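Review session, final week

We close the course with one last complete record, chosen because it touches almost every idea we covered. It is OLIGO-1,6-GLUCOSIDASE, a protein from Bacillus cereus with 558 residues. Go through it on your own first, then we will talk.
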Amino acid sequence: MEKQWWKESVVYQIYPRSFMDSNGDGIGDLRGIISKLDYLKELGIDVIWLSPVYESPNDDNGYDISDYCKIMNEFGTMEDWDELLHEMHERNMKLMMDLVVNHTSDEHNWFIESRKSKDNKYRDYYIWRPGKEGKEPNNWGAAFSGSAWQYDEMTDEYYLHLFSKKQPDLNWDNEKVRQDVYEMMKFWLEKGIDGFRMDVINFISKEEGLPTVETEEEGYVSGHKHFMNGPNIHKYLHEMNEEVLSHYDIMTVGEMPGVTTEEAKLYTGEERKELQMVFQFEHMDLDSGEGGKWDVKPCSLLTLKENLTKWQKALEHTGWNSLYWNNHDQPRVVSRFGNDGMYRIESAKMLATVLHMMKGTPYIYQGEEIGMTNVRFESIDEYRDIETLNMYKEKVMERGEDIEKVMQSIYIKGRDNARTPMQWDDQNHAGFTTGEPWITVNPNYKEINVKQAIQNKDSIFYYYKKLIELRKNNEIVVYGSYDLILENNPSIFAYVRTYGVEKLLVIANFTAEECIFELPEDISYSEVELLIHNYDVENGPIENITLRPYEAMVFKLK
């Protein structure tokens, strides 16, 4: 509806632990980020979203928080943080913090007290329930394997953890908890931050009674149907909005596994007073099968464009879309949807075109701008993620599955694909650290790194930079409507942005083969201007264009 700064922004996501190390320990830190500030400003970034930088035991690298108001030891001190905020605000950049409030670390004070006894005041800050028969309260399973219930002898009850045992879920039906969380939010808002990325916020409201999932299965099954977009989820987000969010000029985005376009309208509708946008996973689950993310399935361009188009259309008149290809939980784009071999540069540019020319706020994950690829370590010992390691024990050690197959799904879906060190140059550890990295740097850093990309004007870095510039300088790319053309073409992803009398025609070849683009007779123009292109083209007319492999181009008509 209304023009908003956060509607016009480009966000860059940084995973602190793998961004830049400035003190020789092999783990990235705050001072390291500060030193790259000018690099990000060159790209054209407006907002920087930092994965968690709070005090944490690191069972899930930051998402298991023991103290919300202190900086993680490995990242620095609060003083390093204050300097980051200032140096960012000095430039015209905004800082968005990750808000992890569905759960805390089991080493957080609230939980320390909570477990002591049943008549403890912090007892109902968490979800404690007695066993049913001699088993857990219900049959839900946790994200990184096993039961979602952990037994505690102190009280002879189980506490709920949708994630690891060390990440017990907060009880949001308790207003003291909500009040406390709001208190903690204002603490960071008073420091001058410009936003919140909310970790699994649609998981926050559980269904009364924590029901067992009606099933004939053997072990633990997902209870997602009973916590995913819970009975009081809209009341809590709107409450949060009245009490905290509305008081500050900030931007918000909720990460929401399982949300639908219709729920997204309720979550993001300007007049609903809840959130500004959400990260949906529909496009991230297109290549997973029946058995979840590890049950890899091929994904065609048709399934992809239909899905992206659907979200484009659903939030055209209400709400606002977020646009992203990857993050710290997903494999890298050029490897997933592109070609990371012979056409790594072309396909990376192609994928950036497709997503950056749509309606909504785009998010760039560190490394995306230089075309970072997935990693293939030959041994499970080189991988670090709880999820991958736990999945490996279960499938290989408990179910007795083939190591080779298990490793193949890790190569395709493992989160570590996204966490190997940022590749700055061709020096020892891609210039990330002078010590030894917490995780091995992808061997391809010798050809794929920031200095190489910055000295070659035909690199992915420069392509992303132009894409961002176009967006800043053309209102149509932010506010224009969206309409998919050539809907059933199995090779070409094409669409039109309309805003006033102008139009943008975006054409993308998603294959390694040459194909023909035929402009629909429906579209009529008189003036044509080539905006960006990943191949050398003196294009005109645009009625019939032969697209080279992974070729992509954007035109402004009239």
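Two points worth writing down before the exam:
The first helix runs from residue 30 to 34.
The CA atoms of residues 465 and 533 lie 13 Å apart.
Good luck, everyone.
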